[PDB]
Description:
part of a larger assembly, 6 chains, B: alpha+beta, 13% strand, F: 112 residues, alpha+beta, two-stranded antiparallel ribbon, 1 helix, binds magnesium ion, RNA-binding, Large ribosomal subunit protein eL27A (chain C), structural constituent of ribosome (chain C), cytoplasm (chain C), Ribosomal_eL27_KOW (chain C)
Amino acid sequence: SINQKLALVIKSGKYTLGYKSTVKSLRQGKSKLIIIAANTPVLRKSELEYYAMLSKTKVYYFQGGNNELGTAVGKLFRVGVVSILEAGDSDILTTL
Amino acid sequence: AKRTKKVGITGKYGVRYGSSLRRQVKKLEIQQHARYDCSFCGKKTVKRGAAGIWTCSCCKKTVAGGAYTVSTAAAATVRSTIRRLREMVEA
Amino acid sequence: AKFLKAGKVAVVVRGRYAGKKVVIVKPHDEGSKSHPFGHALVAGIERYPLKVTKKHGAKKVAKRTKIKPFIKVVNYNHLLPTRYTLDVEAFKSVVSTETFEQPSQREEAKKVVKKAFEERHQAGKNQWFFSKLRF
Amino acid sequence: GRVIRNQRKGAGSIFTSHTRLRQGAAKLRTLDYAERHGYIRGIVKQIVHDSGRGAPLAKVVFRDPYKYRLREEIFIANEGVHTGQFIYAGKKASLNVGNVLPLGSVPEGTIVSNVEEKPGDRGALARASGNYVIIIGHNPDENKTRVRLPSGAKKVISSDARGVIGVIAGGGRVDKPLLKAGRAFHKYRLKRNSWPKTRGVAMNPVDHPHGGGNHQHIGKASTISRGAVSGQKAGLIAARRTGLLRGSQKT
Amino acid sequence: AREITDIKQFLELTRRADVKTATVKINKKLNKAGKPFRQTKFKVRGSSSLYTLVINDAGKAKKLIQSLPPTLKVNRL
Amino acid sequence: AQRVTFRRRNPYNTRSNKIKVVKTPGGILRAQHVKKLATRPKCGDCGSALQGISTLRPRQYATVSKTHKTVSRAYGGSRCANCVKERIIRAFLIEEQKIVKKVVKEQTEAAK
RNA sequence: GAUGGGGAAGCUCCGUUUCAAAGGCCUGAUUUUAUGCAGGCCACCAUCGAAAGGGAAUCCGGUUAAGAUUCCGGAACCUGGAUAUGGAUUCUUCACGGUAACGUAACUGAAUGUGGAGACGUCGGCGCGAGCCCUGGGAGGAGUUAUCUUUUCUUCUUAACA
RNA sequence: CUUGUGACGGCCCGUGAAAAUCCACAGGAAGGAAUAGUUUUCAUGCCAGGUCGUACUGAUAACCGCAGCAGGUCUCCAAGG
RNA sequence: AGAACUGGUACGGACAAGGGGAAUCUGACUGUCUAAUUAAAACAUAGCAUUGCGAUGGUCAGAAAGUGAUGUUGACGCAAU
Ligand SMILES: [Mg+2]
Ligand SMILES: [Mg+2]
Ligand SMILES: [Mg+2]
Ligand SMILES: [Mg+2]
Ligand SMILES: [Mg+2]
Ligand SMILES: [Mg+2]
Ligand SMILES: [Mg+2]
Ligand SMILES: [Mg+2]
Ligand SMILES: [Mg+2]
Ligand SMILES: [Mg+2]
Ligand SMILES: [Mg+2]
Ligand SMILES: [Mg+2]
Ligand SMILES: [Mg+2]
Ligand SMILES: [Mg+2]
Ligand SMILES: [Mg+2]
Ligand SMILES: [Mg+2]
Ligand SMILES: [Mg+2]
Ligand SMILES: [Mg+2]
Ligand SMILES: [Mg+2]
Ligand SMILES: [Mg+2]
Ligand SMILES: [Mg+2]
Ligand SMILES: [Mg+2]
Ligand SMILES: [Mg+2]
Ligand SMILES: [Mg+2]
Ligand SMILES: [Mg+2]
Ligand SMILES: [Mg+2]
Ligand SMILES: [Mg+2]
Ligand SMILES: [Mg+2]
Ligand SMILES: [Mg+2]
Ligand SMILES: [Zn+2]
Ligand SMILES: [Zn+2]
């Protein structure tokens, strides 16, 4: 699957959770990749890639809702979007 | 503690209306009062306003659904059936 | 790569000038003592120019092309950066951190940006920036 | 004898429906140039409960193509329609739940509701909660369509008649027993004055054909011919058969 | 019904060309548990509202009453 | 323990006939009628009570100045602040999408 | 419940927007002059129906043999209309400040459209307010006192509006 | 204790009026300054506010019960033990 | 809540305030009616069953209508038992 790559990011690299943090990270140019949950508000979705398009950042859309993305990163709450500040030891940046 | 054995929510009707009738209303009433997933906000915040009207306390979204549940079996078949024809006609 | 630079055009989403096009003149990523948050020194337009047709002659055109600019400190959280751009050279000097904190030099700072704004608008320059955002 | 009850309803003195709290007549959008040549878009604003009606209402807002106004329509909500959802109505609309495709441009086996028996009457068929209509097949020449009604009867109707895609919300309403005269009382309090009902056999002979006798009994046959006149139609009118249904309906 | 706290505002208000009368009220008040002082109130009957000016100083009270215009009808009570 | 009576000719405890017993400088208890409580104006979009606006019965709004009935932002006394923010966001993105769709549409037709 | 209409020999009946050629709204011109021409605009299309539904705006003190939220005194508010001054704003013509929620003494805006208020069930408990009840100290008055009782009763209040 | 109000919660196959009226916003037609204007949602300043009811009872005597009838007739406030 | 002490065993001391049990017939229950002799085992009721009807319709009204109620309704509906 893909979540196993995400799990290695958490234990090795650095990341942010939530819409406000990622846009701040995306604004400063420190974000390498963002992940959007399927059930994200499409308006909130739409401004994200436009923000990404400005920052020249790869975009990937998670095949799951808020809960699945939250469990994907090993958190007990729901996450609508995550940002990859540094892979650390993962391989998501090169692939997909 | 466990207040009742079997009547559950239907204990308010006392010893009347008949056991079988109390049995059937119990099954439907639990679905009526239950909380459901928000298909938009992904939360246990969907409740029934009136018969067939289900709304999300957060995210302020309302969807029309079953009188006693968020969606009945027939619509689930219909929605798939609609989707079956949709990709059959576009391609 | 960061994109909030000294020539970008953004849209204010909150405040008295909500929905007004602004151009960033001086960014400040790591806040400041007066503003401990990512803020900028944008310059915008409050009264967008009116539509002009062939019928108006030589004075209605002048009246309908008036521009009311403004300068403000704005948090980055209250802006939408755009893919458009508009260079700032004739009024990047006047717009500065000390241009504020007393009204005296605020107006002629606005006077200079007013001249630059209309001058570009007099020619066929940056139509989208001068077009009012309808919503 | 005295005028029996069923006659007395026709005068409409106190037997008219109670229509104070209803939000309006639930009709489809009028059939105009846009719908029969393209499609139009709408926004679902309110999903309101209608008094005296099991199904909920859908309150969709449209744009007038000829004048700068905001014509607002009242639909019958289909199961699966949410507020803020875009609704497409017209001949060229995409086949999605809540859309108002004409029956001509929809493939067989589709589910529709609030179907028009004639083009432009703004919805007649299958307007109750949990009800729906099958499209069996089309007749391309002399455009004309065959559909299945909730009654199980097969009806053939014009291909240009419209009908919204989906199933009317609020299904399964009749499953729950009421358990209470009050529940029946409050239910009929908003429909019309037709409750409670008094048995004709428990009546004086002046009041009803069944009335009278030292024992409560009908006396004559209770199957009344359709050729009878008003005041005799009290019982089973034009009953083809009677008694418990054992076996297939063979319809 | 409206309070004026500016003596300069009060004095010009007496020249509003509509006010015809005014009254001066003397009160005995206690600033605290021990000292009773004399309270004076200046009320000017405007055309649309009554303006009251309160002075807690006897010295300032006297300087004001000589400064009232002579054409104004003053009532002492 | 004085007992008060209605000051008007309507003896029925209706909504317009609510009273509040009050004590007068005369030392007696006299009932006074209180008007119906004002309802806060609501947003047209988010349906919440938009703030910064004085809440009176509708007729009194003709009396107060313009300041009490508005806010210094676009859609001042009409829409919620967050409602304004999202519709500005909605406008810019969709309009920008229209160029994106248009350049794609004319590109794909030019190929053939 | 008229009208347009349609029935009924007829007294009258049906119907209330219906198979109707169903009108005023405001601006400006003309200053022989009154208002037609200049325009533009709009589409419900009579009316009646609540002294408890909705609703613009008032309180206090005093007065009579009998009236008072109506009379007297004082102090307010609303609607409609004529306006003059002060204030405000303008040479960047139709204001500024705050990151923001938003603030102020003001701080143009026709046609048209949108929204809000009007405008709303019942029950249960909780919080808060007002009035009343209880009670202490003190400042006055009255009662009981063969005996006891720092005692018993009573006055100490503050409206609308700002 | 009475009452008002706020935030809540429960109930429905019952979700629990309408209109008059007032305001705001979107809109930018129109009109606008420098030797002078613009402004009557800021303050002050002037005038007027017609017509009809207004007393009293509201009940073991002012209402209907042939009557000064133990009957009937809607509602507000409710001290101490 | 408990403990002593006390009285002609009194003490919810006036007021206030359920008799209970064993069974049979009948109606399931709450509810409604013969104002002024019958309140019930009668009626209603939820549940069960049957019938008619796809609107150019079913049931019902009017003498007639360019007329009506169900119907601001559409078989999980309306109408008749
Ligand atoms: Mg009845
Ligand atoms: Mg009988
Ligand atoms: Mg007979
Ligand atoms: Mg019989
Ligand atoms: Mg009233
Ligand atoms: Mg404000
Ligand atoms: Mg305010
Ligand atoms: Mg008539
Ligand atoms: Mg009237
Ligand atoms: Mg009234
Ligand atoms: Mg009401
Ligand atoms: Mg008052
Ligand atoms: Mg009197
Ligand atoms: Mg007076
Ligand atoms: Mg100012
Ligand atoms: Mg409203
Ligand atoms: Mg006071
Ligand atoms: Mg009460
Ligand atoms: Mg509730
Ligand atoms: Mg009187
Ligand atoms: Mg009187
Ligand atoms: Mg009296
Ligand atoms: Mg009385
Ligand atoms: Mg009395
Ligand atoms: Mg009498
Ligand atoms: Mg009797
Ligand atoms: Mg009896
Ligand atoms: Mg029976
Ligand atoms: Mg019929
Ligand atoms: Zn939600
Ligand atoms: Zn909002």
